[PDB]
Structure formats: C-alpha cells, structure tokens
C-alpha cells in the first residue's frame, strides 16, 4: 500500500555510497536513535509501481536472515519534481567485495578469506532457496561487508547489461544458476575480475554457453579451491550440485580460522578507513 509516511524527521540522508544496477544508494541516519541505514532513493512514477511493490514484498518476507541485509521500512518523499521512494535497509559499512578486491594489493584475496565469504554467500543463498527464491544477480558488487566483517547479500531488483556472472542456462532454469554466479564471484575474488571481463557483453553472452566451464588461471591455488570452482561451474545445471551439497564441500566445510579470518578482514577494513 503506497500510502506510506514522509521520511522528514525520521530518516536523513548523509552521503551517497552506491551507484550500480540497484540505483542511487545513500548512507542514511535514523534521527531519534542515530543508527545508520542504507537508503535507496528511487523516483516513483505512474508506470513504474508494480516492480517497486514486488521488491518491497520480497525484502519484507525474505531479508530476515543474518547473511541478507535487513529491510527496515519504506517512505515516500512528497515533492514538476516527481515523488521519491526511500527503501530503508541494514547498513554495511565496509562496502562491497568488489571494493575489497580493488583496495587489496595485487587485486586478489587470500584463499582463506574467499572460503569465509563463499560460505556466508552460500548460507544466505540456502535461506533464499529454502523459500523458493532465486537471487538472479550474485556478484561481488551485491555481496557486502559490515564494519565487523559480517557478509550480507543485497539487490532483489532482478529477483523481482553485464552477463559475466550469468549461468549458461539463463542465457539459453532454477536455484542452481545462483551457484554458477557464486563460482564466478569466487574467481572474481581470486583473479580480481570475472572470466571474459575484457570482452564486450555481446561476445560474453555468445561465449558463455559455448566455451567450457571456466577455471583459475594460476597454479598457486589449492586443490580444494580448484575442486570447489569446478563443482560450482558445471555447464549442465542438472549435474550441478545443490546449495546444501556445496556447503558440505571441503573448501566450505573445512575453515578452521572462522574467528581468525574475520579478525584479519576486520583489520584490513580498519586500514582502509584510517589510511585516507
């Protein structure tokens, strides 16, 4: 019901943080408590109304898992200047996995960090898949980190371009397509960019269903990580493992430093804020 409250006196915009496939996202502040939130500001027209209402319902029902940024509420800023809808979400201070790769020296993440991040994406995906929901847009831009290095999934717009993370069956499907995208995100974390990044999106769209399943370029990566990527990236989706199966894989299952990897990531986050 689009008869929502005006945000005036409740939530205030502080700084713009996001500008991707999800739109114009701001770092907002709750006036009375001083708590931070992510506010997505979108122009509410006559035509575009059905797509916005579907995104809200998805968030209201499915965002209540620890690996998905929580929905806090929605507001309409009444205004020649069209009315704006404010989508209030849980704030993830450390930014995206894409930013984490860009800030790390040599644009590659430590294998132990990849395993932690992948496990958290997989847990969030498991929650969505249990509720018969496909994310449809898994990529480093959509995987965010909190200041305490907690991993949260964002953007349910596509759930309600850049084909680099798209599974062959999607280009040609079910929950298994998100697991292909996780594999591509894992390579993105390992190599700094997804396979076929250097090519035009049209060539990538043509090549993905035709080329054999991608693999890691370097021989430096562990046999466990190499097998994980191979398990994720199975072109024939019928033969690709489910979410619960992939969670049981040694790369995800055997992570002894869950406490010591989180502390390392938090220290890397703190070094980025302190140094400029």
Site for Na ion, rule CB under 5 A: 68, 70
Residue 137 falls in the annotated catalytic set = yes
Nearer residue to ligand 824 within complex by CB, 112 or 150? 150
Question: Which residue stretch of 43-51, 88-96, 220-228, 241-249 sits at the interface with ligand 824 (rule: CB under 6 A)?
Answer: 88-96
Q: Is 192 left (phi over 0), alpha (psi -120 to 50) or beta?
A: left
Give me the least distance between CB of 25 and Na ion, in Å please: 17
Contact 164, 214 (CB under 8 A): no
- Asked if 95 is part of the footprint of ligand 824 (rule: CB under 6 A), the reply reads yes
> Which residue from 219, 69, 87, 224 is spatially nearest to 154, judged by alpha carbons?
69
Give me the least distance between CB of 147 and ligand 824, in Å please: 9
- Asked if 18 is part of the footprint of ligand 824 (rule: CB under 6 A), the reply reads yes
CA distance 210 to 1: 45
- Among Na ion, ligand 824, none, what does residue 195 contact (CB within 5–8 Å per kind)? none
CA distance 43 to 57: 18
Catalytic residue, chosen from 137, 174, 178, 198, is 137
Q: Which of 120, 137, 150, 155 binds ligand 824 (CB under 6 A)?
A: 155
Question: Which residue stretch of 92-100, 121-129, 172-180, 227-235 sits at the interface with ligand 824 (rule: CB under 6 A)?
Answer: 92-100
Contact 167, 183 (CB under 8 A): no
**For the chain, where are the alpha helices, taking DSSP H only?**
50-62, 97-103, 111-130, 168-171, 177-191, 201-210, 223-232, 243-247, 250-253, 258-274
The annotated binding site for ATP is made up of 17-25, 40
Q: Which residues are catalytic?
A: 137
Footprint on this chain of ligand 824 (rule: CB under 6 A): 17-18, 22, 25, 38, 40, 69, 87, 89-93, 95-96, 144, 154-155
């Amino acid at each position: 019901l689009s008869a929502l409250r005006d945000p005036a006196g409740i939530f205030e915009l502080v700084e713009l943080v996001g500008n991707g496939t999800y739109g114009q996202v701001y770092k907002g502040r709750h006036v009375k408590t001083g708590q931070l939130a992510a506010i997505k500001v979108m122009d509410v027209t006559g035509d575009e109304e059905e797509e916005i209402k579907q995104e809200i319902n998805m968030l209201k029902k499915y965002s209540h898992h620890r690996n998905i940024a929580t929905y806090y509420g929605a507001f309409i800023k009444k205004n020649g200047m069209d009315d704006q809808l404010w989508l209030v979400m849980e704030f993830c201070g450390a930014g995206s996995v894409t930013d984490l790769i860009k800030n790390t020296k040599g644009n590659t993440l430590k294998e132990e960090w990849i395993a932690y991040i992948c496990r958290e994406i997989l847990r969030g995906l498991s929650h969505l898949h249990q509720h018969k929901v496909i994310h449809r847009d898994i990529k480093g831009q959509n995987v965010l980190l909190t200041e305490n290095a907690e991993v949260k999934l964002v953007d349910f717009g596509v759930s309600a371009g850049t084909p680099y993370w798209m599974a062959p069956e999607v280009i040609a499907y079910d929950f298994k397509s998100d697991l292909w995208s996780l594999g591509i995100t894992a390579i993105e974390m390992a190599e700094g960019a997804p396979p076929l990044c250097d090519m035009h999106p049209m060539r990538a769209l043509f090549l993905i269903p035709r080329n054999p399943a991608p693999r890691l370029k370097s021989k430096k990566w562990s046999k466990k990580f190499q097998s994980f990527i191979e398990s994720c990236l199975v072109k024939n989706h019928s033969q690709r493992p489910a979410t619960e199966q992939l969670m049981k894989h040694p790369f995800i299952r055997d992570q002894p430093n869950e406490r010591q990897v989180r502390i390392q990531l938090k220290d890397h986050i703190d070094r980025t804020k302190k140094k400029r």
